[PDB]
Amino acid sequence: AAVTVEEVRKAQRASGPATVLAIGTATPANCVHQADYPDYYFRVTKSDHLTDLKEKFKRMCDKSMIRKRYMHLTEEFLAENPNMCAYMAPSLDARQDIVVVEVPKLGKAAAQKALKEWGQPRSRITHLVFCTTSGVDMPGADYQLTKLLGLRPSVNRLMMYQQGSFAGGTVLRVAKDLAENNRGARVLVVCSEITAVTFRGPSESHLDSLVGQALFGDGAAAVIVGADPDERAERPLFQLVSAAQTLLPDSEGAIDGHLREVGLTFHLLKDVPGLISKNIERALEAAFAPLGISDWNSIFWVAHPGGPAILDQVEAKVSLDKARMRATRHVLAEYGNMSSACVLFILDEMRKRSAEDGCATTGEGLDWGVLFGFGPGLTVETVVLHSVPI
Amino acid sequence: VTVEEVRKAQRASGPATVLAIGTATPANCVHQADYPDYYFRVTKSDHLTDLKEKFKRMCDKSMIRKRYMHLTEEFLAENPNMCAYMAPSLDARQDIVVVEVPKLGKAAAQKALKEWGQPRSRITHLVFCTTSGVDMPGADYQLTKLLGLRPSVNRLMMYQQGSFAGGTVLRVAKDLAENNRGARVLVVCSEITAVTFRGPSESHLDSLVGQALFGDGAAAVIVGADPDERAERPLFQLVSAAQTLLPDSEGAIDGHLREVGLTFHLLKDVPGLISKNIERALEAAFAPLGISDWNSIFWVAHPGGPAILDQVEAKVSLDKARMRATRHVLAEYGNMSSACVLFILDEMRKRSAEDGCATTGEGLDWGVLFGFGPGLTVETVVLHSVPI
């Protein structure tokens, strides 16, 4: 009645670009070393008699380029739940009972670290973006995390369920609009993935699911995003310049994922590394041409480590310097494939190594960077990042 | 090129505007007057006469005249596990909704896109919201294919949201259309009850009441900033958007996706809790605008149930005409979860047209859209009508 909508819009809106104010990561305590996983996995699933199948899983884990992973699932638990140890056995209820609890709990550990580095009180958080691919529930994990952290009972929550490995970029793309369109907004972004929904025994008939057993790991990464940082009170890490999403052509059913009574099952049709390599440059050009940037070796890289073959085939297609994917490959080695949370681990790794290596910026000395998310549909999320002087 | 130069050229200017609304439902229509007989027949529960009497009272007090349901008596005959109260059936239910949910959303999206009149290539964002099943790639991907939208459309997949997500999608579309020059957000809420349909159980009347209220439907809305005065005709403006959790409302509405499907659980007094807090939500949204006469703003309230509307309307002594659109959608469609408030929007502007009302908001200037759902979550969207 007093103010007009244009006056509200003018007042409501923020200035400046969405900025990463803090990054925090967390994993389950239980740590499984990749060198020992073929024996561990084949023992807990009672499959040591399938010798030829175990030999293939050994080479699978050898090619994985993963040194270790963290998993909430323990041998003691798995001994009590043979329905989650067989390849195809009704067990979704058992799996949901775990993830609907542990996924929010692990996200709290990651967000607690991000908030402590942030230094501001939780009460300043105005937006919560929670993303997971491990189970669904109502109220969602976003509700669980809010209660666990004690966030304001008016936080604008966004719950990303069953998204897939590309959601790491989707959450940044979402946070970018939330922080930039609302003046004092402070967005807590949380990705949390626990493999208890996809863990299952081996089968010589469904080898695509076997690679998942060699790559998927548990973990959560939290990020605090906001525009117009408070100087001397907040420490800008990266800037979210732009975000785009796209579907690669001829990639229709490349990676399918179905939530059934046997839990979450993944199905691999078509060459995923090849499909990404053939089109990565086109994604790079769409995001950096209006920027006047052509040298793909002049920008710091953040790529979802879906598998070592994806990294190799993209690094070879565009002739990347082997230092550009150093942070990406490092996270894959110490954590495995953690689905959406992976790209947020690499961000934390890149900035951590940069400050420890005396780089000029948080982006390995470079100014501009690119963040790639890869997942079902052959969806590619592309986020143009910018570093901050160190 | 510096980041600041990007930000200035990349963000939109005016307020987020609803440019079109389209709705769609399954063909099969089921009349509330016959549902007690039908429901207890297909579920083979006619031996529970005392229960059938309770259900009949549920349906008669529901203020629902008819509902649309993809589930047919023929299909239910071939799937007795979905007619039982608790029997393994998630695979069967998923097989339906992963296919029909995007398809029903396509029917509504076609309508909306037609009224919009612009080429489908101009759609830059897609927000897909459903509580009926999950899949990878999600329903957003299937709809992108079905509609022929551009690859590179920015998709947001809202799975397993609940009955408050009608407001959620608007909140999302608002920030998307306002921060990005040229963005045109296609918003689709699509719900199908084949994931919650189940037989009756004397020990769980709360699940039984869901069987009397929930219905199928999809609604599409096209949201954009800075409309084209020539090619585009605005319908509503999204001024603000806010979500909040209601105190002492823990466990009021729970929903679990299990091997027997999606089961709903009811604790506490949902209408009493929403009525007890509705005035705080109004004041929080409208006090900074100088508004305090709830009778002089149009209303779009999620019709989670008749009691909710009655008790909210009684709390603020609402002019009974303020809920006519909400209650009509409830009567003619039932509780379609997230899509409800969008159906109500469409019925508001349409009734506003054939009535000779000065605005799309029943002649009024400012309005409120409420979404109610699990966590006792309340979404509050402040709207502004458009002159007719």
Numbering used by the authors:
A (entry chain B): 6 to 395
B (entry chain A): 8 to 395
Show me the paper's own sentences about this structure.
The C170S mutant PvCHS was generated to investigate its potential impact on the local conformation and confirm the catalytic role. The asymmetric unit contained two mutant PvCHS molecules, as observed in the wild-type PvCHS. The overall RMSD between the mutant C170S and the WT PvCHS was small, with 0.26 Å. Importantly, the catalytic triad remained stable with a distance of 4.49 Å (3.2 Å in wild type) between the Ser-170 hydroxyl group and Asn-342 carboxamide and 5.57 Å (vs. 3.2 Å) between the serine hydroxyl and the Asn-342 carboxamide. Nε2 of His-309 was 3.84 Å (vs. 3.2 Å). The noticeable changes in distances are associated with the shorter sidechain group of serine than the oxidized cysteine.
Chalcone synthase (CHS) and chalcone isomerase (CHI) catalyze the first two committed steps of the flavonoid pathway that plays a pivotal role in the growth and reproduction of land plants, including UV protection, pigmentation, symbiotic nitrogen fixation, and pathogen resistance. Based on the obtained X-ray crystal structures of CHS, CHI, and chalcone isomerase-like protein (CHIL) from the same monocotyledon, Panicum virgatum, along with the results of the steady-state kinetics, spectroscopic/thermodynamic analyses, intermolecular interactions, and their effect on each catalytic step are proposed. The production of these value-added products also offers the prospect of increasing the value of the crop, especially because many of these compounds are soluble and readily extracted. This study characterized the enzymes involved in the first two committed steps of the flavonoid pathway, CHS and CHI, and the non-catalytic protein CHIL. Through crystal structure, molecular docking, mutagenesis, kinetic analyses, ITC, and FRET analysis, our study provides evidence supporting a revised catalytic reaction mechanism for monocot CHS and CHI and identified an intermolecular interaction of CHS with both CHI and CHIL in a non-competitive manner.
